Structures are given as structure tokens and as C-alpha cells.
Symmetry: C2
Subunit: 439 residues, 2 copies
Amino acid sequence: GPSFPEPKVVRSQGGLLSLKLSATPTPLAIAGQRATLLTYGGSFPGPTLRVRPRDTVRLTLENRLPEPTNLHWHGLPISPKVDDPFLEIPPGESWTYEFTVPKELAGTFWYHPHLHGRVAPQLFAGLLGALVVESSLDAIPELREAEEHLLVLKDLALQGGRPAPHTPMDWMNGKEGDLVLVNGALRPTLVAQKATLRLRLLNASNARYYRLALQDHPLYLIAADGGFLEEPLEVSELLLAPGERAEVLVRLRKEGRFLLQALPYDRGAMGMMDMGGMAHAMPQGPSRPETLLYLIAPKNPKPLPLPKALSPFPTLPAPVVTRRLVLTEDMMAARFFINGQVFDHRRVDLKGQAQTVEVWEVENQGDMDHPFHLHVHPFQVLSVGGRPFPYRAWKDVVNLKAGEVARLLVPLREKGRTVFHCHIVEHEDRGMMGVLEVG
Amino acid sequence: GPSFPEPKVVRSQGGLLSLKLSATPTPLAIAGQRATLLTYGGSFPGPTLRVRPRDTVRLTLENRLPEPTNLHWHGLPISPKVDDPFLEIPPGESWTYEFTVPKELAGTFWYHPHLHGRVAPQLFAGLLGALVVESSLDAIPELREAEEHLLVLKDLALQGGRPAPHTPMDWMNGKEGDLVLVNGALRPTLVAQKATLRLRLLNASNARYYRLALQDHPLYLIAADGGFLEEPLEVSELLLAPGERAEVLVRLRKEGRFLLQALPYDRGAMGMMDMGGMAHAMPQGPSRPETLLYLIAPKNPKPLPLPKALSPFPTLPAPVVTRRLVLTEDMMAARFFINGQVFDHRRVDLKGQAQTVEVWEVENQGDMDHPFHLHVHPFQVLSVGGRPFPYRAWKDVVNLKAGEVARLLVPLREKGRTVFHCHIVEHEDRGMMGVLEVG
Ligand SMILES: [Cu+2]
Ligand SMILES: [Cu+2]
Ligand SMILES: [Cu+2]
Ligand SMILES: [Cu+2]
Ligand SMILES: [Cu+2]
Ligand SMILES: [Cu+2]
Ligand code: NA
Ligand code: NA
């Protein structure tokens, strides 16, 4: 096949993407070994769904797992009556998700399970795939002429030909695996045919962070989780926390082989040691560097000019309320809290008004990084840790290092009950989730 | 002194730059050796004059040379009654140039002799200096915060402690020297203190070309000969022909030492060989590579963002005439022609109307590169060799390789008699110059 593996794409046809997926244990070859994963559509990752604004999506999920499951349409501003975090699809049953893609939308999104208490093992076992919303902006020459690729970053650990089970330490830290894969492949080679690449990046890992850097090159950020930036932003590296997405342009500068690496990054994961007194928790420290893929530049590369503008960011109405959410940890219990409470699906924590704008101040009073995710209502990150954000774009996950406060501008869109939670999904399963009701 | 030598600057004071220069043989230390050069203001290069639009310049040139001389205010759109190519200042006499700097003007210009038949030996011996027109655009943060330097590129050859005399081959080719200097210094070191440099570049050589490339870096072109571009233009290298100027931003990417080089370039200079029959002219081929300076980047360089816009280029009226100028050579005679004629100061070759726009098609039917210069009336280069120019900016010198046609948009500004000529100044002295009268 093509030197660079990418998930099979399913495109809407005549404005309709109508598809039956099964969530099923699946024998696969992965990273040179045979394994049984839990997959959508028989593949790992699941198929990439590619749609346009105003398309209808009709997705029937058949549950062939021994456990209940459901779907979260991560990042899509649709109704929480469709993107329903409380729905359970029992084993053997099916459910049809039907929605219209919003008009003012573009970017890379994804789908994965969201059945509270079961997300981490289901996501770790392989249940995830991408959704791309194509934009009329993709026709501008500086993007149309770029070579486009999707990079699904997800790690895995295997034991006896199956995903390794969660340990107690995994529930505390979030599980990371030793197989650090791109599109399910181990260190694939991307042989570029054009000098400009457009890379859609998705961190679909349970807990692993990717401090992305391409040898000898900057990256040009053109989209965040849920939409384009206003103009490209040059960066030397790009941290992608669990659940985050980005799109970057790469402008290949000369012939040769360049590594795309996940550089060392310390997210605050903890180990245990015994040195006499003890036993006591100790930091794991930074991750070991990983090579994600090999990028081969073409002969005599002449990259296109960057686009000068992308999409203007909407002017938002003045906000009507300020919220404060505080994140705390009980690491030895593997319990995680928002404002001192664990998730309770019967308890509404915040009540807001549709079509108003709110300011959310999310404060990490723990020692681990926590990537904060809000369903249904994309937000604008104003500042994190007291540093203004260098661009305007829609996001739906924001990473908070220990001690940091993120200030978010949250326009409330669709009415209904939805959730916010840590996207280290072990922490969500262990309680770090709350309920927002919009009316 | 400062590790990077630059000419002393003379600034206008209260809107007036009033200065007496003497053109004089001057004992100097240059490139580690003692030499007697012909200088303005006792230095090589002469002092940099720094003015703003609407300033008055009052420059009294005292001629202390044994030959007549004059000044050409290269690139300034002022009256040819001030910038007078036919004026002769006899030995021992003085002349005061007085003009107002035009309102809509910015960039790097320069001054040098323009007494027909004597330019090449006077310019080669050291008579040149820079003029900078400061702009309100210099206050935008992306430029204000850059570290600015002027680089006067000029080569020299010494014989018996004096500039080497012209040979017959020098009159045919244009004289190049073995000492390839920046600001009169041999391979100086520029120890950058900021991560973004703004470099004003001037090729003040008689005939040498500089195919400029900075190791491991692109250059961002922000101004051509006579004004800013509309937006920065990324280039991997930049060819500066005799008389041309440019301004570039350099965005230092990492710590280290980076050479700024004049890469090999074949301008069509000719030698003579005898292999049996003979003797016959043979191409010299490409120049040998030269290191111009050593650039030391600071620690942990974080360059500023590029400006997104510079200055919009004026919309010009539709043109009223098309001209054709053809350049030809008689190399073995060292005679050079425009439309089949050599310069005659009594003969008007073109007659145009002030405030109209003309299209000039300049065609090089020789085998050497010829850099075509027009006094008094800056032009917009539309295309060269059938390739559209990638930016809009005012230029006053355009390089033509063998066979190439340049199409120029020439707004005629000040009334009076002026000249156009090759800026390989040996070729001008040997006849490749014509007269334009604007009325
Ligand atoms: Cu998600
Ligand atoms: Cu967390
Ligand atoms: Cu969720
Ligand atoms: Cu000149
Ligand atoms: Cu010439
Ligand atoms: Cu001239
Ligand atoms: Na299946
Ligand atoms: Na003097």
C-alpha cells in the first residue's frame, strides 16, 4: 500500500453520510504483531468520516462488545440530545445518531466511547476514529496545493495479544503504552511528494502527551481543536494533550530525512518508591523521547507561500457570568474532584442560559497536568497561567499544568444537559466530571 | 570599536542636513594594510547621511582631486537640475547641492561620482557613501525592535598602496577586485544582540555581483532599491547587481556561527586564450565563492514575527507610450551601445511628458549581464526574461541577463534632461548611456 498508512475515509454522498459501524473485538496485525483490539468498522483507528457543513450524518452504532458503550462526537457543537453522554447502548443493541453538521464549522474532530466508568479501557483498547469537516477555505491555493495527511497519535500496550489491563497506578496516572503509534503504525515513513504538507494532528491517547517537534523545521499552526486560527502562527514545537487536535503546515526546507518526535515532557505522573522508611509517591519525571515518524523531503523542495489570512474569529457578546472550577486530586485513592465533588449523573453543577457568553476560570490545584474538556460548547482560551493566548480559535480541550488558571470565553449554544471533565479519561472514570445544564 | 564596522552617520538636525564634504586622496588603514584611497569625508565608505522626508539637504562638495568630479544622488527622485549628470566641478572648486527630500520616499540610496568617462576609476578608488531615508514605517514594532545594520558591499584591488589601475580587459568587463569588503572591512564579524536583524544592503562595486546567501537561513526581502515592498517576501538567495540596494530581515533560528556568502555567479565576464590558432575571447565563468561576513547568533534566539504589511504600492495611471531600448556590445573594442549608438551629451534620445507613465522594454542583446539604471524616475519592474516580478516596489536598477527583456513601468516625475545607462560603470564610461528629456 501507500508508504504512509492512514485510516480509510468515508465521505458524505449527496449531503448524507449514512453508515453502520460495529464496535467489535477484532483480530488485527498491528506493529508487526497479531492482536485482538476493540475497533469500530474493523480497523484501528476506526474509519475517518469526512463531511461538509450542513451535511446530514446518520450513524448507526451496533454494540458487539460484552459491555455497554456509547459515542461522544468530540468537539462537535451539536445537541446533547444527540451527543448524549448519559446514553447506554447495551451489548447486542444498536442506536442511530442523526445530526446536521453546523454551518459555521471546520476542522478535525473525533469519536470515541463516553460511558462513565468504562471509557479508559474501551478507548485504550482501540475504539476511536477521526471526523473531518471540510471547509471552503480548503480551496485557497496555499492549502489546496499542500499535501494533506491525518496523524492519529495513540499509544498502546499489549499483553497476551490483547490490550494490557489497567493497574491501580494506571487509574491514578492515566495509562500510557510502550507502542507509540501513528495511525496504528509503528514509526511509519512519510515520503513527501510536495514541499508543503498540511498535517491534521489528533491525540487520541488515554493520557500520553506529545510535545511535537520536527527536526530542523518550525510548524505553522493553522487550526486548533475546533476551527481555524485567524492567520498562521509559527511555533518551534507544539504540545498536544489528550483529546486535542491541531492542523499545521510544514514547509520542507531541503532534501533529506527529518524525524517528527515527541520530545520529553513531564505531565506529573507519579510512581512509588521505598528507600527505608516509605513507601512514598515520587515523580516519574519527563517522558522518554519518541520518534513518531520519518519524514522524507522531495528533491529541491520549493514550498508554497503561507496563506496570509485564514478565518476571522467571531466577535462575541459581552459575558454575563464568571464561573470558577477548581481541580484537585487524591492520588493515593485515585480520586479526582471538581470544586471538591466527584461526578454524579443526577446532580446539575452549573446552570447557564443558551446564547449567552460565560467566562470560565478553571484552576488546577493538583500536581499533574489536567486537560479540561467541555462537551457541546466550544470555547475561546483567553489566557493560561496568566499568559495571554497567542491566537484566537475555537478549542474544546485546554491543558492546565499544576497551579495554572485557564480563563475561557464560553458561548453557550445548544440547550440541554451535558458534561465537562478531564480528558485523561482514567480521571473522568474516577470522578473528575461535572454536569452543565443549558436552558 | 564595535565588532561590526559601519560608516559614521550624519543625521539631519531640525529638518536640515547641512554638510561640507571634500573629495580627497586619503591615507587609510584598510583590510590590515595602509593605502591611499579617494574618499568623501576622509573615510571609506564615505559617511552615511540619514534624513527624513521633507528634510532639506545642503551638501557642499569640495573637489580636492586632480580631476573634475561631481555627485549623482543615486535613486533619489529629485530634479535633474540638482542631480545634474552634466555638471563638472573642477579641481579645487566647490558646488552646493540643495534639495528637499520627497514626501513619499523611504529606503537606502547612495552617492557617487558621475562625470562621464571618469566614473569607473573614481568609484573604484573609494568615492561612495550611503543615504538613508527614514520612514514612519520604521516605528512598527516588528521593525523598531530589529537590530539594524548597513552593509556596503564593495571590492577593491591595491597596487603599490593605491587602487590598482584599469587594464583594457577591465574596461571591457568592468573591474573587480580581490579584496571583497563589507563597509571597508575584510570579513568582519557581526555579533547579533537581537534575534531579528534588519540589514540594508548596497552593492557599490564597479562590476562585481553578490549572489547573497546566509548559511541555513532564508532572507525576508522588505525593500528594493527605492522603497518598501507591499509585504515581506521570503527568498533563499538574493542577487545584488552593481548599484542595487535591498533591505532584508534575518530571523536567527538557533545559536551558532553562520556565513553570509557571495555564491558563485556568472555575469558573462570574458578572458582571452591562445590554444594554437587564436587568440580568442573565452568566458571567465562563475565567480569564486566569497565569505562576506561571519554572523554570530545570540543565545536562545526568539525572532519577532514578520510584519504582515509594509507599504501599499501606488496605483499608477495607464501608460501613454512604449519604448524599446536594445543593449549591444563590441567587446574587443570595449564599446557598448543603446539602440546602436554611444552616448553623446548633446543628443536627446527620448522625449517624454512629465506626470505620464511610460512602458520601457529594455532588451539585452549582449552576452554579459547589464544592470540598467535610470536617473530621477524610479520604476516598477513588471517582468524580466518573460517572468513576472514577484513583488511591487520602486527600483532604479534592473539586471538583465544575456537575451532577457525587462518590461518597466516608468512614471516621469521631474522635468529636465537626465540619463539612463549601464551601472557597470566602465560600460557607461565607454558609451552605454543615453539622454532622456522630460517636459
Ligand atoms: Cu473526547
Ligand atoms: Cu486529569
Ligand atoms: Cu466527555
Ligand atoms: Cu549609481
Ligand atoms: Cu553593461
Ligand atoms: Cu548615472
Ligand atoms: Na467489525
Ligand atoms: Na578629507
